[PDB]
């Protein structure tokens, strides 16, 4: 919906003409979803009361207005400084609650509200700036591509050439991953976005140590915990034409392986 331009003022390169930009996230066929019957939307009087502790959506996360985002004021729409600092995941309302598009719980979910710059940087590669200033705990963009299984995660890994840096646009859907009970849908090797060939802006922006953005898990339906979102945000105050940057590292081995 918002433009994406791109501009090289430094050499002769340009994007691959194999590299294609999705809205959505692409799912592998063997990708397991939450069955039909569990999926389960709150049943909110007005888009106003699911910012409250009664909200079904909220149901997951602890107390402390109990959804993320700011209510009022000069950061309202923001994700908040609790959020921001503990980096718990983000329980939005999504396809099946009684609220409308316009939910005050649903911003990761109405998308990049936002114009973005692919540009070449001096020596460093494609990059991302965007037009506007970026206030902190705004959000950007999801980080998209092919979702996957951690075995055909596995097997990218180990039997493509390390030529295509595969490891860079692996991301893996691993916020509620944790070796214990809830099946190995939970308890084994996460699913994975793959970026290298189908992705959005935010594919290229450059890694950093010290990023002013950073990537949060969003949860639609409770039962599709296993394939969150990768969402960003923008941890620091952006001005507009400073480069976007994020923590690759913070499967490788394997890567590759095969192959060796
Ligand atoms: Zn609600
Ligand atoms: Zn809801
Ligand atoms: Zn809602």
């Not at 959505?24 to 066929?29: L, M």
């Not at 009022?72 to 959020?83: E, Y």
């Not at 950073?214 to 507009?240: C, E, Q, S, T, Y």
Request: charged share 30%; proline share 5%.
């Amino acid at each position: 919906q918002l433009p994406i331009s791109i501009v090289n003022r430094e050499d002769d390169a340009f994007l691959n003409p194999n590299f294609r930009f999705i809205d959505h996230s692409i799912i592998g066929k063997n990708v397991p979803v939450a069955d039909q019957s569990f999926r389960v939307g709150c049943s909110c009087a007005s888009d106003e009361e699911c910012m409250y502790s009664t909200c079904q959506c909220l149901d997951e996360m602890a107390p402390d207005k109990r959804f993320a985002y700011y209510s009022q004021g000069a950061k309202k729409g923001l994700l908040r400084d609790r959020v921001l600092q503990s980096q718990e995941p983000i329980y939005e309302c999504h396809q099946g609650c009684a609220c409308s598009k316009d939910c005050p719980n649903r911003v990761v979910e109405r998308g990049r509200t936002v114009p973005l710059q692919i540009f070449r940087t001096k020596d460093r590669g494609w990059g991302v700036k965007c037009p506007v200033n970026i206030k902190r705990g705004q959000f950007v963009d999801r980080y998209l591509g092919e979702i996957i299984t951690s075995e055909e995660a596995d097997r990218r890994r180990a039997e493509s050439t390390i030529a295509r840096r595969k490891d860079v646009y692996l991301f893996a859907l691993d916020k509620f991953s944790d070796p214990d009970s809830l099946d190995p849908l939970l308890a084994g090797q996460p699913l994975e976005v793959d970026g290298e060939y189908m992705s959005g802006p935010t594919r290229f922006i450059n890694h950093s140590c010290d990023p002013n953005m950073a990537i949060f898990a969003r949860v639609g339906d409770h039962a599709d915990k296993h394939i969150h979102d990768l969402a960003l945000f923008a941890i620091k105050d952006i001005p507009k034409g400073t480069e976007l940057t994020f923590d690759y590292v913070n499967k490788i081995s394997e890567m590759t392986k095969c192959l060796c």
